[PDB]
């Protein structure tokens, strides 16, 4: 359901982000 390396994680400020672990980049918007 969630692509390998892609993680849905939140920051303690209440902001959710998708982190791609292979490219190790922070993505805010859903790439679809």
């Amino acid at each position: 359901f969630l692509p390998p390396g892609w993680e849905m994680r939140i920051a303690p400020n209440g902001r959710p982000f998708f982190i791609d672990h292979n490219t190790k980049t922070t993505t805010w918007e859903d790439p679809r």
Binding site: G5, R9, I19, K24
Partner: peptide, 13 residues
């Protein structure tokens, strides 16, 4: 634009 913090690695998958 929502502030983006420089990627820090949280618990690895």
């Amino acid at each position: 634009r929502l502030d983006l913090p420089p990627y820090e690695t949280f618990e690895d998958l």
